[PDB]
Design an enzyme around this catalytic site. Sequence first.
Site, PDB file in Angstrom:
ATOM      1  N   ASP A  90       0.809  -1.226   0.000  1.00 34.47           N
ATOM      2  CA  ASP A  90       0.000   0.000   0.000  1.00 34.47           C
ATOM      3  C   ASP A  90       0.842   1.275   0.000  1.00 34.47           C
ATOM      4  O   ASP A  90       2.003   1.270   0.423  1.00 34.47           O
ATOM      5  CB  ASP A  90      -0.931  -0.041   1.216  1.00 34.47           C
ATOM      6  CG  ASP A  90      -2.163   0.825   1.055  1.00 34.47           C
ATOM      7  OD1 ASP A  90      -2.548   1.122  -0.093  1.00 34.47           O
ATOM      8  OD2 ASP A  90      -2.762   1.186   2.087  1.00 34.47           O
ATOM      9  N   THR A  91       0.253   2.353  -0.514  1.00 37.97           N
ATOM     10  CA  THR A  91       0.891   3.677  -0.560  1.00 37.97           C
ATOM     11  C   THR A  91      -0.121   4.638   0.053  1.00 37.97           C
ATOM     12  O   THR A  91      -1.263   4.259   0.311  1.00 37.97           O
ATOM     13  CB  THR A  91       1.177   4.148  -2.006  1.00 37.97           C
ATOM     14  OG1 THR A  91      -0.038   4.147  -2.759  1.00 37.97           O
ATOM     15  CG2 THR A  91       2.171   3.242  -2.684  1.00 37.97           C
ATOM     16  N   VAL A  99       8.573   8.289  -6.826  1.00 39.81           N
ATOM     17  CA  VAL A  99       9.386   7.066  -6.870  1.00 39.81           C
ATOM     18  C   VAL A  99       8.611   5.991  -7.619  1.00 39.81           C
ATOM     19  O   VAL A  99       7.386   6.071  -7.746  1.00 39.81           O
ATOM     20  CB  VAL A  99       9.739   6.565  -5.449  1.00 39.81           C
ATOM     21  CG1 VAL A  99      10.591   7.596  -4.734  1.00 39.81           C
ATOM     22  CG2 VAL A  99       8.473   6.288  -4.667  1.00 39.81           C
ATOM     23  N   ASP A 239      -6.341 -14.178   3.015  1.00 41.15           N
ATOM     24  CA  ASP A 239      -6.473 -14.521   1.591  1.00 41.15           C
ATOM     25  C   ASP A 239      -7.866 -15.030   1.199  1.00 41.15           C
ATOM     26  O   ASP A 239      -8.538 -15.693   1.977  1.00 41.15           O
ATOM     27  CB  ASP A 239      -5.421 -15.587   1.217  1.00 41.15           C
ATOM     28  CG  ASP A 239      -5.230 -15.742  -0.290  1.00 41.15           C
ATOM     29  OD1 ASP A 239      -4.719 -14.797  -0.923  1.00 41.15           O
ATOM     30  OD2 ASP A 239      -5.588 -16.805  -0.840  1.00 41.15           O
TER      31      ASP A 239
HETATM   32  C1  LIG Z   1      -0.147  -8.083  -2.857  1.00 43.01           C
HETATM   33  C2  LIG Z   1      -1.452  -7.689  -3.434  1.00 43.01           C
HETATM   34  O1  LIG Z   1      -2.083  -8.369  -4.219  1.00 43.01           O
HETATM   35  S1  LIG Z   1      -2.069  -6.225  -2.948  1.00 43.01           S
HETATM   36  C3  LIG Z   1      -3.232  -5.384  -3.969  1.00 43.01           C
HETATM   37  C4  LIG Z   1      -2.725  -4.071  -4.521  1.00 43.01           C
HETATM   38  N1  LIG Z   1      -2.937  -3.059  -3.502  1.00 43.01           N
HETATM   39  C5  LIG Z   1      -3.866  -2.078  -3.557  1.00 43.01           C
HETATM   40  O2  LIG Z   1      -4.679  -1.905  -4.480  1.00 43.01           O
HETATM   41  C6  LIG Z   1      -3.861  -1.119  -2.379  1.00 43.01           C
HETATM   42  C7  LIG Z   1      -4.177   0.251  -2.939  1.00 43.01           C
HETATM   43  N2  LIG Z   1      -3.406   0.585  -4.114  1.00 43.01           N
HETATM   44  C8  LIG Z   1      -2.287   1.344  -4.012  1.00 43.01           C
HETATM   45  O3  LIG Z   1      -1.902   1.783  -2.917  1.00 43.01           O
HETATM   46  C9  LIG Z   1      -1.486   1.705  -5.263  1.00 43.01           C
HETATM   47  O4  LIG Z   1      -2.353   1.672  -6.388  1.00 43.01           O
HETATM   48  C10 LIG Z   1      -0.305   0.802  -5.647  1.00 43.01           C
HETATM   49  C11 LIG Z   1       0.711   0.680  -4.525  1.00 43.01           C
HETATM   50  C12 LIG Z   1      -0.764  -0.607  -6.009  1.00 43.01           C
HETATM   51  C13 LIG Z   1       0.375   1.441  -6.864  1.00 43.01           C
HETATM   52  O5  LIG Z   1       1.224   2.534  -6.532  1.00 43.01           O
HETATM   53  P1  LIG Z   1       1.748   3.476  -7.707  1.00 43.01           P
HETATM   54  O6  LIG Z   1       2.329   4.684  -7.041  1.00 43.01           O
HETATM   55  O7  LIG Z   1       0.583   3.561  -8.631  1.00 43.01           O
HETATM   56  O8  LIG Z   1       2.811   2.734  -8.634  1.00 43.01           O
HETATM   57  P2  LIG Z   1       4.071   3.306  -9.447  1.00 43.01           P
HETATM   58  O9  LIG Z   1       4.509   4.717  -9.016  1.00 43.01           O
HETATM   59  O10 LIG Z   1       5.074   2.179  -9.636  1.00 43.01           O
HETATM   60  O11 LIG Z   1       3.219   3.434 -10.756  1.00 43.01           O
HETATM   61  C14 LIG Z   1       2.217   4.437 -10.805  1.00 43.01           C
HETATM   62  C15 LIG Z   1       2.762   5.432 -11.782  1.00 43.01           C
HETATM   63  O12 LIG Z   1       3.066   4.695 -12.964  1.00 43.01           O
HETATM   64  C16 LIG Z   1       2.700   5.447 -14.104  1.00 43.01           C
HETATM   65  N3  LIG Z   1       1.805   4.688 -15.051  1.00 43.01           N
HETATM   66  C17 LIG Z   1       0.500   4.833 -15.371  1.00 43.01           C
HETATM   67  N4  LIG Z   1       0.095   3.897 -16.314  1.00 43.01           N
HETATM   68  C18 LIG Z   1       1.144   3.135 -16.612  1.00 43.01           C
HETATM   69  C19 LIG Z   1       1.445   1.983 -17.500  1.00 43.01           C
HETATM   70  N5  LIG Z   1       0.519   1.416 -18.302  1.00 43.01           N
HETATM   71  N6  LIG Z   1       2.711   1.497 -17.486  1.00 43.01           N
HETATM   72  C20 LIG Z   1       3.669   2.029 -16.702  1.00 43.01           C
HETATM   73  N7  LIG Z   1       3.464   3.067 -15.879  1.00 43.01           N
HETATM   74  C21 LIG Z   1       2.256   3.661 -15.781  1.00 43.01           C
HETATM   75  C22 LIG Z   1       2.247   6.793 -13.509  1.00 43.01           C
HETATM   76  O13 LIG Z   1       3.377   7.617 -13.213  1.00 43.01           O
HETATM   77  C23 LIG Z   1       1.753   6.500 -12.135  1.00 43.01           C
HETATM   78  O14 LIG Z   1       1.854   7.686 -11.333  1.00 43.01           O
HETATM   79  P3  LIG Z   1       0.576   8.498 -10.768  1.00 43.01           P
HETATM   80  O15 LIG Z   1       0.490   7.962  -9.356  1.00 43.01           O
HETATM   81  O16 LIG Z   1       0.909   9.979 -10.872  1.00 43.01           O
HETATM   82  O17 LIG Z   1      -0.603   8.199 -11.680  1.00 43.01           O
END
Ligand SMILES: CC(=O)SCCNC(=O)CCNC(=O)[C@H](O)C(C)(C)COP(=O)(O)OP(=O)(O)OC[C@H]1O[C@@H](n2cnc3c(N)ncnc32)[C@H](O)[C@@H]1OP(=O)(O)O
Length: 355
Positions: A90-91, A99, A239
């Site tokens: 999570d973030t 980052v 899970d």
């Molecule tokens: C273990 C499990 O199964 S847990 C389930 C996943 N967890 C959750 O859903 C909890 C809630 N979700 C979250 O907290 C977040 O969505 C996270 C942690 C999953 C993702 O964090 P992010 O900060 O989005 O990931 P990261 O920085 O690597 O990538 C996002 C960035 O990639 C970029 N991006 C967008 N689309 C794409 C793409 N198709 N390809 C590559 N990069 C992309 C953007 O810069 C985006 O930044 P933004 O936040 O300004 O839109």
Amino acid sequence: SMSLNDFLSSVLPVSEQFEYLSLQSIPLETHAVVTPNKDDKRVPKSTIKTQHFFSLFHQGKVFFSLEVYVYVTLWDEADAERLIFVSKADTNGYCNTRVSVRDITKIILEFILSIDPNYYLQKVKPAIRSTCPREILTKICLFTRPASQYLFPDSSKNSKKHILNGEELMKWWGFILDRLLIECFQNDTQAKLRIPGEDPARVRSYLRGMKYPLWQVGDIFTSKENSLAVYNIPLFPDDPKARFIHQLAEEDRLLKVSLSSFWIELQERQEFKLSVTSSVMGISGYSLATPSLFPSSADVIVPKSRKQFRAIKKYITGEEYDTEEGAIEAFTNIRDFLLLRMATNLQSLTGKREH
Ligand SMILES: CC(=O)SCCNC(=O)CCNC(=O)[C@H](O)C(C)(C)COP(=O)(O)OP(=O)(O)OC[C@H]1O[C@@H](n2cnc3c(N)ncnc32)[C@H](O)[C@@H]1OP(=O)(O)O
Ligand SMILES: [Hg+2]
Ligand SMILES: [Hg+2]
């Protein structure tokens, strides 16, 4: 052999200051991750479970957290398996810099992946036999279901907190496990993806775009699709699969439902039935380089008391992130708890990856 500190900094922004928390629990002897089967020549002698909880901070504010479980299963004074189960990531968007969360996670997995299995065994009391690292089967399991928050309560608010959607989120992990497969496993490693949202040939359509040559629709517990779920599905904490298995034990159906119908029925459980897109990824193979790292005081901090562990972790999963105050408080509490009751400073590191 790199350290967590080396791994991290190598993928964090160049010349930027971050500090991290690598909290591990004391290796514990518990019950079989997969329900044993009497009519089975093999039943595990020992199943050592241990948790790795990580956190990244940026200028006194925590913004990311990863909850991982490692299961070391021993069978015949020789065979062993180590299952790395990714539970929660999570973030909360409270870091003044940008980052690659995708990269941080991958690297933290490369790290957990390089930990010599005996590292966990030696800590177990009483002493537990040791297996050979060069030949331990290693598995990774993860269940992608997008959500509001998982480790940071109410961080859903914080206007700028990117939240991926089922599919978006499924391509994210996909990219990570693919990268891990390419640079960590051997050419014949099993890589499975299964999206109980159906479209069997639609999953296939997606896997084509992966670098690892062997992705296949399916899971890593399904050999003969007609076997009984109970003796093959692993029961991980919080899970969805474990949830369904205990439902199946209420309705005295354990002995009746096969892996095949297990997946078919798993979807309609309100957990799915169209509601968001969930997938099940799985890896089962042998490491490229044999794991032989024994984490240091800098790589991991192991509170000696399940209680003290739950305490430190509570300082993160127990805040109020509807505001940036929580991100700041979480930091403070940990740094302060560490320096005042464990005489330890959060490991600190300068970025290094250019743009
Ligand atoms: C273990 C499990 O199964 S847990 C389930 C996943 N967890 C959750 O859903 C909890 C809630 N979700 C979250 O907290 C977040 O969505 C996270 C942690 C999953 C993702 O964090 P992010 O900060 O989005 O990931 P990261 O920085 O690597 O990538 C996002 C960035 O990639 C970029 N991006 C967008 N689309 C794409 C793409 N198709 N390809 C590559 N990069 C992309 C953007 O810069 C985006 O930044 P933004 O936040 O300004 O839109
Ligand atoms: Hg940020
Ligand atoms: Hg590697």
